[PDB]
Amino acid sequence: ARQWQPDVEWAEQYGGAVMYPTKETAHWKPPPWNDVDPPKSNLTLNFGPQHPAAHGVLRLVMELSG
Amino acid sequence: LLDLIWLETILPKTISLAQMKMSTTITSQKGLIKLYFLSFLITILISTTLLNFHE
Amino acid sequence: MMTGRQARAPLQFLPDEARSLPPPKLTDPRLAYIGFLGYCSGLIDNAIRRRPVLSAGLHRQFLYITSFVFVGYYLLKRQDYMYAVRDHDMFSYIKSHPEDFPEKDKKTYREVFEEFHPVR
Amino acid sequence: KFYIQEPPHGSPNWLKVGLTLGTSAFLWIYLIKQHNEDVLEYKRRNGLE
Amino acid sequence: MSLVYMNIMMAFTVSLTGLLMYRSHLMSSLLCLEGMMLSLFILATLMILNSHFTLASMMPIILLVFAACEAALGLSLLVMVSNTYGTDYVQNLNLLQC
Amino acid sequence: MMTYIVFILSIIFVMGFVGFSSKPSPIYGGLGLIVSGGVGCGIVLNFGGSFLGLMVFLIYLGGMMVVFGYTTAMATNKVVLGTFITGLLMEFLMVYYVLKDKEVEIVFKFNGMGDWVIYDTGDSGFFSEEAMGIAALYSYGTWLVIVTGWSLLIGVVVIMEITRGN
Amino acid sequence: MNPIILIIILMTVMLGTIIVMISTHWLLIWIGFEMNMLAIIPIMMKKHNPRATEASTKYFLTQSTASMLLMMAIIINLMFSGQWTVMKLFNPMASMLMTMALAMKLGMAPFHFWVPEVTQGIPLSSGLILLTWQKLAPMSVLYQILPSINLDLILTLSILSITIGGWGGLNQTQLRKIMAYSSIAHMGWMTAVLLYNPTMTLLNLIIYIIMTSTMFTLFMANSTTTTLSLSHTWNKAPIMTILVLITLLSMGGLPPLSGFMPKWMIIQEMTKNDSIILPTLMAITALLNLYFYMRLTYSTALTMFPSTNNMKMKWQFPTTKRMTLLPTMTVLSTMLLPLTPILSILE
Amino acid sequence: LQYGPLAYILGEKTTKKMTENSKLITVDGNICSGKSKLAKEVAEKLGLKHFPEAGIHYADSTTGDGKPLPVRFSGNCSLEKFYDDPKSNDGNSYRLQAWLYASRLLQYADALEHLLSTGQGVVLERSIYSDFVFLEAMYRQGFIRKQCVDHYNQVKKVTVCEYLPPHVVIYVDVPVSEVQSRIQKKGNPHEMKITSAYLQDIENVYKGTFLPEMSEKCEVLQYSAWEAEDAEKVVEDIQYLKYDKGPWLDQDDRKLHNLRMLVQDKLEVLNYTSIPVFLPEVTIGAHQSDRVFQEFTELPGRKYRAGYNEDVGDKWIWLK
Amino acid sequence: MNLMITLLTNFTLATLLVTIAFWLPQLNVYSEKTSPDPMGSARLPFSMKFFLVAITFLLFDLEIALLLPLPWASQTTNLNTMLTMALLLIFLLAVSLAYEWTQKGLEWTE
Ligand SMILES: CCCCCCCCCCCCCCCCCC(=O)OC[C@H](COP(=O)(O)OCCN)OC(=O)CCCCCCCCCCCCCCCCC
Numbered sequence A: 001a002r003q004w005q006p007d008v009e010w011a012e013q014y015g016g017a018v019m020y021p022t023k024e025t026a027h028w029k030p031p032p033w034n035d036v037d038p039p040k041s042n043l044t045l046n047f048g049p050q051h052p053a054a055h056g057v058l059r060l061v062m063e064l065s066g
Numbered sequence B: 001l002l003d004l005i006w007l008e009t010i011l012p013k014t015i016s017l018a019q020m021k022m023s024t025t026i027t028s029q030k031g032l033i034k035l036y037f038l039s040f041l042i043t044i045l046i047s048t049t050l051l052n053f054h055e
Numbered sequence C: 001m002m003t004g005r006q007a008r009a010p011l012q013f014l015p016d017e018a019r020s021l022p023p024p025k026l027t028d029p030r031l032a033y034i035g036f037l038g039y040c041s042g043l044i045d046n047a048i049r050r051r052p053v054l055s056a057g058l059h060r061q062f063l064y065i066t067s068f069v070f071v072g073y074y075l076l077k078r079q080d081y082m083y084a085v086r087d088h089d090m091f092s093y094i095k096s097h098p099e100d101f102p103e104k105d106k107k108t109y110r111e112v113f114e115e116f117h118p119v120r
Numbered sequence D: 001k002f003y004i005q006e007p008p009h010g011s012p013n014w015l016k017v018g019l020t021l022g023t024s025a026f027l028w029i030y031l032i033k034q035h036n037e038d039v040l041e042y043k044r045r046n047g048l049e
Numbered sequence E: 001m002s003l004v005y006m007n008i009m010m011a012f013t014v015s016l017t018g019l020l021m022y023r024s025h026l027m028s029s030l031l032c033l034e035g036m037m038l039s040l041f042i043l044a045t046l047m048i049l050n051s052h053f054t055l056a057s058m059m060p061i062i063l064l065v066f067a068a069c070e071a072a073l074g075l076s077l078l079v080m081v082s083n084t085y086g087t088d089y090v091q092n093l094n095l096l097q098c
Numbered sequence F: 001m002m003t004y005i006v007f008i009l010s011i012i013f014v015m016g017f018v019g020f021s022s023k024p025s026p027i028y029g030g031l032g033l034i035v036s037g038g039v040g041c042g043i044v045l046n047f048g049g050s051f052l053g054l055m056v057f058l059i060y061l062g063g064m065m066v067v068f069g070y071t072t073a074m075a076t077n078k079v080v081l082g083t084f085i086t087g088l089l090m091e092f093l094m095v096y097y098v099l100k101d102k103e104v105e106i107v108f109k110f111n112g113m114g115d116w117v118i119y120d121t122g123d124s125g126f127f128s129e130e131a132m133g134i135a136a137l138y139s140y141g142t143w144l145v146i147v148t149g150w151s152l153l154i155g156v157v158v159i160m161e162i163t164r165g166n
Numbered sequence G: 001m002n003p004i005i006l007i008i009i010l011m012t013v014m015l016g017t018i019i020v021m022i023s024t025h026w027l028l029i030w031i032g033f034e035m036n037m038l039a040i041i042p043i044m045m046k047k048h049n050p051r052a053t054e055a056s057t058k059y060f061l062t063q064s065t066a067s068m069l070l071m072m073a074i075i076i077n078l079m080f081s082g083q084w085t086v087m088k089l090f091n092p093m094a095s096m097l098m099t100m101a102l103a104m105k106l107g108m109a110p111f112h113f114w115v116p117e118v119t120q121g122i123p124l125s126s127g128l129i130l131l132t133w134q135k136l137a138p139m140s141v142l143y144q145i146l147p148s149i150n151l152d153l154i155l156t157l158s159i160l161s162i163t164i165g166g167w168g169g170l171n172q173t174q175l176r177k178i179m180a181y182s183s184i185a186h187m188g189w190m191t192a193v194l195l196y197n198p199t200m201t202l203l204n205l206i207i208y209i210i211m212t213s214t215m216f217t218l219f220m221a222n223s224t225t226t227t228l229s230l231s232h233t234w235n236k237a238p239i240m241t242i243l244v245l246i247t248l249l250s251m252g253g254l255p256p257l258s259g260f261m262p263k264w265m266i267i268q269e270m271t272k273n274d275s276i277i278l279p280t281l282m283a284i285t286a287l288l289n290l291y292f293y294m295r296l297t298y299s300t301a302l303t304m305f306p307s308t309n310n311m312k313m314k315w316q317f318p319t320t321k322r323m324t325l326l327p328t329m330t331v332l333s334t335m336l337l338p339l340t341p342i343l344s345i346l347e
Numbered sequence H: 001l002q003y004g005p006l007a008y009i010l011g012e013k014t015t016k017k018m019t020e021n022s023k024l025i026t027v028d029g030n031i032c033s034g035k036s037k038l039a040k041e042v043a044e045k046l047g048l049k050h051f052p053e054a055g056i057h058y059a060d061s062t063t064g065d066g067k068p069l070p071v072r073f074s075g076n077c078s079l080e081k082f083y084d085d086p087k088s089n090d091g092n093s094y095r096l097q098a099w100l101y102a103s104r105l106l107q108y109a110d111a112l113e114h115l116l117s118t119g120q121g122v123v124l125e126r127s128i129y130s131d132f133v134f135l136e137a138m139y140r141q142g143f144i145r146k147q148c149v150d151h152y153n154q155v156k157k158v159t160v161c162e163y164l165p166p167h168v169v170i171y172v173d174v175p176v177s178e179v180q181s182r183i184q185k186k187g188n189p190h191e192m193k194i195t196s197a198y199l200q201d202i203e204n205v206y207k208g209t210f211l212p213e214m215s216e217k218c219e220v221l222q223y224s225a226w227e228a229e230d231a232e233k234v235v236e237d238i239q240y241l242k243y244d245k246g247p248w249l250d251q252d253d254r255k256l257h258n259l260r261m262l263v264q265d266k267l268e269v270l271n272y273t274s275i276p277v278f279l280p281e282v283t284i285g286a287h288q289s290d291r292v293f294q295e296f297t298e299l300p301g302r303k304y305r306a307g308y309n310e311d312v313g314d315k316w317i318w319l320k
Numbered sequence I: 001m002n003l004m005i006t007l008l009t010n011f012t013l014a015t016l017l018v019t020i021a022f023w024l025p026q027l028n029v030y031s032e033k034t035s036p037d038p039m040g041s042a043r044l045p046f047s048m049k050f051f052l053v054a055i056t057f058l059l060f061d062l063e064i065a066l067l068l069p070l071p072w073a074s075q076t077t078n079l080n081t082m083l084t085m086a087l088l089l090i091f092l093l094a095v096s097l098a099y100e101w102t103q104k105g106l107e108w109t110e
């Protein structure tokens, strides 16, 4: 009748990470579409009671950011 | 036997599966840079000792 | 190969002896096919941006044709120059070396015994 | 009117068409003058008059 | 030829084989690269002084400056890798296998 | 033995490159590269390369290896000792060969004499020739200074671009 | 990235390539390569994702090892000839190390193990620059040292680059790795004819740059990075499928397309020098490249894959990407075979 | 293209028109939370430009004549058939949700384009940050599958990361029964078929997912039903916000230039809407694709670029 | 030779005093003690800014390495070229500092 065109079964063949997924090339995914892999913090200082520039007896739990 | 199997096998299909398998041997690398620089060192060793390209 | 020739006067597109050659005529079929490449460039430029292919950018297609003819003219001058310099080096080398080139004594086919191979 | 937002290519860009046609015709007259200068220089250097 | 040139070339090739065989760290790869640069610096200096070739005395300074800027570039690449993964281990750098 | 000071510093230089380049950890590798840079500097200084040896000690060690240890301080085995002693065995066997034969051949051929014999017997007057050649970077090395300064300005710009992360 | 800093950095890339092309001193050659690498590193890190940092790190390590081997070859040349003229070399060990260094800089096999990864990690524009502009300077140095190049070494690197560039792309769906293996195979084709006729080297280089620039420009214009995403292009702009059709048929070496021109001229020169087996094996290996090009053409142009519904929204919006010189680069990469004796302008 | 990198080099910096009133506002709420007139009132008090809720035909409103094209060319989806058959076999549900997400993505790109080119803040209605609130409700009520939610999360991961959050979120606490009474006073025979548990899942995903992550990356304002009516109280709450949270602080000229070069390329905004994850609710076969494309190409104003159409009377084509 | 004797003597005195400091009070047996910090046990977070000031030091140290032959280069017979290139190198160090300035690189360690 009319000119045949490929289907989803044909389309998902060309769409892996490789063309011939074998035993070695099996655990391979396509990358994220914008080539951005997910990123997979701030310091927490505890200035204890050991220090003269704190006036005597003080414990300071800081949260620095650099 | 001849003209759907064996003449169809001996020239094109054996070559096609051979190129398939050799392409799987080429492109099945684990991505590891250590292995690639190790292969580069093996190349310089073979080109110094085996084929004597320094001559 | 000819890199020792155009190094005494380097980076010359067309040297001073290139003007002694004839220039390509403006009806050169090489240059005409270059102008056809300009027309095809104008058509692809009107096609990739979804303009009307033949109807949009007649000034744009005219500048594509103008630009390709204007570049290809000097490219053909340099082409003719380099094949002329190739033949000049060849002829000067054959003239200045008679011992490297024997004039062949041309045996006529009455003296030449070729084997006959019968198709029977 | 047809379009809700005015297209960039609705009105012709007369500066762009002027630069296009002017640079094109300048290259055409420079090429014609170059070809006439080259045929005159050839017909002088090899002497074909 | 001269005996010390053998030693400097062998130090270059030992730093080569260190660079050409990763163990774990990328900083060690940069250190092997700069050991290669160090041997090149020494070998250039011994040649240029043994020749009494005066104008090339400025060449080892140029080698040192350009390859120290190269080393700073590599240290910044290492720092961005170790900001992404937490360490500069080379086995983290295999996402481009596929 | 005393006529062999460039050669003995070169043997220590090869041994130090085997020491760090077997890569225990980048801290001790930085240490071994620093000690190796010092003895290679001694190799340079014993040919009258006083400015280039001080360029080792100033520039190489006091700036760049300081930055390497600085980054090693922030960003962050049997194989090490085995490949270490393998390189030490290869080097001492090559030394024993070139000392028994006064000849060796691995890539090139090398004479086994004291390396003082490859020198010149002249003088240079009231100047170090190597110092005046480095001073000629300004009178003669105009293009060299232009491309070096432009590569360093681009180096600053490039570091600030790739470390910004935006 | 600042556009002013983008201008200065790309001009610094071009200035490094120019310093390699115009200088008569080996130190200035090495300086030009240092400037080139040092400037092109931020162009790879334009989007600031971990794959680009990984790719820039692998690129740095390979190019830095190549630059140190290049300087060692220069230093051996200063040992054995006392001079610095950029010309032939005066020692086959310096010749071998400089051939190794330039083969590393071109990503020729078996130093090919960075080009698909580095081309994969970086964007399409920086991949275009890496596969076209960064192939200029080491081919210039190989052009200037060719009286000293060992024939066995350059032909071994050439056959290994042609075979791996063939067999590498046969199992690939990413576009950038396909272009990278095509680069490795084409560098093999360039360096094989180099000691026979380097004009054909220049010819193959320029035609490869035109074809590669065409395909990367189409990939940028259609925002395609995989084969499967390239297969949606007919439902959005079918002229793009026709142009990637004819250009991928050109890049494999089909006549009458002008990518048949370089490899035909390479066989035309290598068979003059009585090498008949070697361009035959080269031409038989190029059919692998043409095979996965046929795969890409069937996936994109000559068929029509099923699409998704949101393409109907993209039917309404025109391309605003300034496709710079794309019709010129498509016309030149396909239809230049009648103008084949233009190759004498590279003499 | 009037704007590009050359317009950035020649002096035009987009913070030279970025005043305090230039705030992107997204007004949010349930299907009858009354936010419709509230967004227009907040827009007309502060002089901000109002962009309504993207229906099916927003992309028809931006291109061509502005009039709505047929649904077979834009969408291939019916909201009414979703209201009638929410568990439909033909896959209208996620196809409608994906088309609405692409429409809101286009509207959000237009919103940031207006904010960056004109320096005027824009009041929105259910931006892309509040589009999965209907997805998870349709999933909890079983209207679509797990793979549709996976496809949506893929498209959200590769679209919403390219954009900054809004400044002010004006959400309106309305109970479900008041929304149901407003639907029954509306009288729409399609809108009344919306069940109770669907609206309750909408409110659940609202109060438990949208506001707990927009409370930090931007500024929330959470009103009731009867105090979101006085517009002046809301505008007074907007004018006295300490703008200290959010990534709108670290946006100099270069980052907003990157954003402006992003949001004018609408095929780059809509680049990864059509990722080839062949999901049967949205996968169109090639014959129907070519048929709908060649019926769409015959529509007036659509065969060529928007200044190149003789059938709608674009003159001077022979000089363009 | 005299330099090597002086280096060996200074290194010997350093190692001798370190030997006396690590073995003469280590003749003590004193007592088997156990001894069981602002950060407790967590990993030291990287500081981008300290690395950037180290790289800025390295690049300006290379520019210093270019500037060091100036007291020798003042003796030259090409003095106009020497003054031009000397002012240009110090100018390039200043332009590197200006680009470090204006692009916010000298901030929070200014
Ligand atoms: C003998 C040896 C001597 C030398 C011989 C000649 C060698 C020529 C080598 C040319 C190398 C060109 C390198 C590629 C272009 C460099 C600039 C660039 O990257 O352009 C792409 C640019 C990216 O823009 P950006 O905004 O950064 O995009 C990011 C994502 N949108 O913009 C875009 O993406 C816009 C889209 C179109 C880009 C087209 C760029 C084409 C460049 C190549 C032109 C053709 C080559 C010259 C012709 C042959 C000459 C022999």
Ligand SMILES: Nc1ncnc2c1ncn2[C@@H]1O[C@H](COP(=O)(O)O)[C@@H](O)[C@H]1O
Binding pocket: H029, H030, H031, H032, H033, H034, H035, H036, H053, H055, H079, H097, H100, H134, H135, H138
């Ligand atoms: N999944 C969905 N289910 C029902 N309505 C939706 C959905 N997504 C978007 N809407 C729209 O949200 C509108 C409600 O907003 P409004 O009536 O303006 O308060 C409806 O009229 C629909 O057009």
